Amino acid sequence: EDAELLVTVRGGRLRGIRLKTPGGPVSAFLGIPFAEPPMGPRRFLPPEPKQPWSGVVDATTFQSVCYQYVDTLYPGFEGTEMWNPNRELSEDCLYLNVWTPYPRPTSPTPVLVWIYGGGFYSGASSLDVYDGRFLVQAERTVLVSMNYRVGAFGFLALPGSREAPGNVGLLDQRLALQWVQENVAAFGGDPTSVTLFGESAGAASVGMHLLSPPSRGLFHRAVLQSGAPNGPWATVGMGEARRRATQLAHLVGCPGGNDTELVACLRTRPAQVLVNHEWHVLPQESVFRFSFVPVVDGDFLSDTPEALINAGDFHGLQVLVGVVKDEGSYFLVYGAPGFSKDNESLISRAEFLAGVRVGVPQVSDLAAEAVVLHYTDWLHPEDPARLREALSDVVGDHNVVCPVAQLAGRLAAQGARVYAYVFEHRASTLSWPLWMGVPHGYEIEFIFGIPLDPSRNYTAEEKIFAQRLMRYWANFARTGDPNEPPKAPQWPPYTAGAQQYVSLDLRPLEVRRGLRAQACAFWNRFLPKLLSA
C-alpha cells in the first residue's frame, strides 16, 4: 500500500490515486461520498450526511454527473461539448473531490473550493476544464470540488412544503462545505483558511453562501467569476417557483395533502422524463433564463440578495470579482433572432428590437423602450454590426456585469476589501466565432492552469498567462490579496468611488475605472425605479 494515498475521514477509510502533472505528482481523492444518495423517497429532499462505512472506499475516479439536460444545439462542436456531462447521468451524484500535494503537507495549507456553473440546470465537477491537479501542484494549495443537484432535482420548489422545500442544491453545497470543515485537515488542508470560488451559477452560489449565515461560518474568502447572487436569473420568487413546479408536475401527469401527493407523484417519474419537460415551464421565450433556480423563501435566503447585500456588514471579508470581456455573446445563439455561431450574426434593427424582449424578458413595454433608448446609437441606429454588439451588451450587462458591479460596490462600501478584474484574453484554441470575442466561461481554463496540460496545444505565452493567473488566485486564497509580497504593477482594491479594476491579458496589468458605469447606472439605479411604477 502507498500511505500517501490512504486517508481516514470521519466517515471512514479512503483510498486515492497518484496523479501525474507536468510539475510533479499530486494526490487525488475523486468521488468521495458526502451525502446519502438522494434517490427514490429522497428526491427533492435536503441532503442527509453520508453514514459511516467499514473498510476502504476507493476515491479513485470521478463519480456520476447529477442528472441534467444535455445540450444538443451544436452536436460535435467542441465549444459546446466541453460543458456536457463526461460521466453517466445519475441521481446518485452527491460526491466531492480532493486534490492535495504529493506528499501530503505537514503544515496546514490554504484550501480552494470550486463550485461549477451551468445556470443551476447543468454542470459537473468532473469536467476536464475543472481539473484541479494543475492548481495544486503549481501553488501548493488543497483543492476541493463537489457535485450538487441541478434542475428540478436541485431547485424545484413548492415553498412551505417539507417534501420539496427548494434550494436543496444549495444545501448540497453547504453539506460539502461542512465536510471540508470536518475533514480537510486529514488531507493537510487548513479549515481556517477556506476560499470559495465559482463561475456563472457557481459565482451566484458563492454569493448566496455569503448572504446566508449558516454558510458564512464555513469559509473565509470568496471569488465570484462572471456571476452574482443578485442577477435577475439567479433567484426566483416563491409564487413563480411554485408556478413552475406545478406546471412541470402537470406536464408529466401529476396528478396527506395536495403538496405531499403532488411530490409523491413526481417522485414516481423517471429522471429523464422530468428533464424532458424542464424548459417548457418558462413564462416566455428568452435567453439567460433558467427554469429551476434558488428560491427566495425566507430560509436559506431571509430576503432577496439585493436587500441582504445592501443591509450587510461585510467587515473582515475579502472578495475577488470579475467578468470576461463579452458576457452577452454566448447566450445570444440560444434564441436571439438572427444569431448563430456559423454566421457573423449581423442583425437588423427589427431583429434587435425583438431581441431586446428576449434578452430582457418579463418587463413592461416602457422598460423595454428604456433599454432600446440607452443601447441605441442614434447617429447609427440601424448599423448591423453595432446592433449585434449592442444586444450582446444588453444581455451581458443585465445578467452579469451590472449585478457583479452592484455587489462589488456595496460590499466595498460596507466594509469588505474587494478586487475586480476584466478578463480580456481570447484563447488560441477557442472554437467559437471571432465576433463573440471572449465569451463567458472562457477564463476558467486559464485559472485552473489547463494550458499546462502537455496533451493540449496552447501557446507558450498562454502557459505563462495561466501561471500568472493561478498565482493571483492562490495569493488571494492565502492572504486575501492577489498581489505578491514586489516590482510588478499592483492590483488596487475596488471602491465605490474610484471603481478601479484590472485587465487580465497577455500584457501586464492595466488599471481602469468603472465597470460599465454609465450602463450599470441604468440597470442598478434607474430601471428598478421604473419597474415600481
Place this chain on the structure above:
Amino acid sequence: EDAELLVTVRGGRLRGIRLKTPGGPVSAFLGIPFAEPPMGPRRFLPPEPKQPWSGVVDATTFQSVCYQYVDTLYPGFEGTEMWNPNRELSEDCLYLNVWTPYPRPTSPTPVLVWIYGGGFYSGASSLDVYDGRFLVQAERTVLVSMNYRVGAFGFLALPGSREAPGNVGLLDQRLALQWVQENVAAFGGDPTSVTLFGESAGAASVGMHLLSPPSRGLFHRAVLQSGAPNGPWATVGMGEARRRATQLAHLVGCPPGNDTELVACLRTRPAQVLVNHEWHVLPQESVFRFSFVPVVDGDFLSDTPEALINAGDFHGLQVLVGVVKDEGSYFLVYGAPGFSKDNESLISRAEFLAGVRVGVPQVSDLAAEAVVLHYTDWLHPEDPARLREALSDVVGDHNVVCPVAQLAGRLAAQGARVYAYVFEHRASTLSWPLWMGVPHGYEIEFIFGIPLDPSRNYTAEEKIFAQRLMRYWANFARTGDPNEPPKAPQWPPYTAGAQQYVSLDLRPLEVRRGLRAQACAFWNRFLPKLLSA
C-alpha cells in the same frame, strides 16, 4: 423735401427718415400704426385694423414698447439691459417698421420679417440689436419688424370666452403680416417673397404661423433661431391657462364668477399692476417658464404643435433652423441654486439635483431621476465643473436644442428642405462670464450686421463674420438656400437620417452630424412615453 422718404400706404401718407450706414444710406419709416390701439375695452381682444388717417403720419422714430416686465436682476449690466425696453411703455404699442434701400427700390425686392423673442412676456422691435439698417444696405432687402402684445396683454386666456380668447399677441403678428401683403410693395418690397425669421419666443412664433393655415399664406420661407413652437415653454394647456388667468385676477383684487365679470375687472386695472404680479401665477419655482404664452384651444392651433408637425405635409417649404453653443447657460442665473454671473458657479451635486427640479418643472419624480441618470457622469458624479455644464445641458436640451431637433427632423422627413446650424462664436464684446460660453440670443447681433457699426468695438474678423452671416440669411430669403451659388465648403440640407448641420464661427463652414442625438432621443422619444404611464 425728399420724395424718397414719402410713402402712401392704404391707411394714408407716411414720412420716413434717411439713416446713415458705413456702406451708404437706407430709408426707414419707424412707428407705422398697423392696428387700432388695444386700450380700455379693447384690452385682451384681437387687434383691429388701423383706420385710415388724413395728413401725414410721422414715421421717423420708434414708437412705444408694449407693456412688459423690466429685468432688474443685474441693474446697469449690459448683458441684461440690452434686452430691456428702450422706449416708454404703453398699451398703445402696435406699430411696425420697414427698412428699405436708399433710394427706394423700383423693382420687387425680397422681404425679411423679424419677430422678436422675449419669452412671450417681453421684447421690442426698437432694441438696438434689431437695427435693420445694416442687413438692408448690405444685402439689398426690405426688412420689416413689428411690435406685438406680450405678457397678459398678449396671451392671457379664458378659453371659450370672447372677452379674453388668448393668442391675440399672435394675431398682432398676423395682422402685421397681412399689412405687409397689402402695403410692402409701396416700399419696393415683394409680397410674393416674404421670409419670416425670429429668435426664442420669436422663433416659436414663426413656427406657429407655419402650423396655422390663415398665417401660412402670408409668407413663403421661415427661419427659426433657437426656438420652436413645440418647446415645453412655448404653449400652455387650456386648463392651465384658465388657472393662471384666474390666479392673476385674484392677485390684483378681481373677483375670482363670470368670465365677463372677471375680465371687466381686469380691464379697470392699470397696465403696470398686471405686470407686477405676472411671474407669481407660475405653478412652481422654475427656469425657462413664462406665465402667459400661446394657448392650444383649437383655434389658432387646431392641435398641439407637435401633433400638427407630425401630421403635416411640408413639401415646398424651406426652413433655416439652428441653436447657439450654450442654450442653457443664460437662464441658469435666474433661480437655479448656486448660479451667478459673478462667480464660476461651481455647484455641488445637491445643488445639481435641486437644479434639475427647477430646470425640468412639473414632472414626476421618476421623470426627474431619468434626467439625473442621463446627465450624470457616473465616473465623476460630484465634479462641480461637470455638474455646472450638465445642468446647462439639461435646460438647453429640454427647452431649445431638442425641440428644434424634433422640428427639423420631422419637417425634413415630411417634405421640407431644412438647413441647420450651430452658432459657436463668442463675441469679443460679450459681458457675460466665460463659463456661460455662447449664450442664448448672442448670435442676433451678428445676423443684423451690428459689428459693422464703427462706434462699436468688434474686431475686423468679426465684421467679416457678420457679413458672411448676413449673406447666408439673405441667400436663404432669396432662394431658399443659404449657399453662395461656390468652391467654398457647401452647407448641406438637414435630414432625419444623416442629421447634418454646420458650425458658424470665424473658421470656414464645418459639417457635423447630430443635434445632440443621444440627449434628444431621451427628451423626444423616451420621456414622453414615460409621462404617459
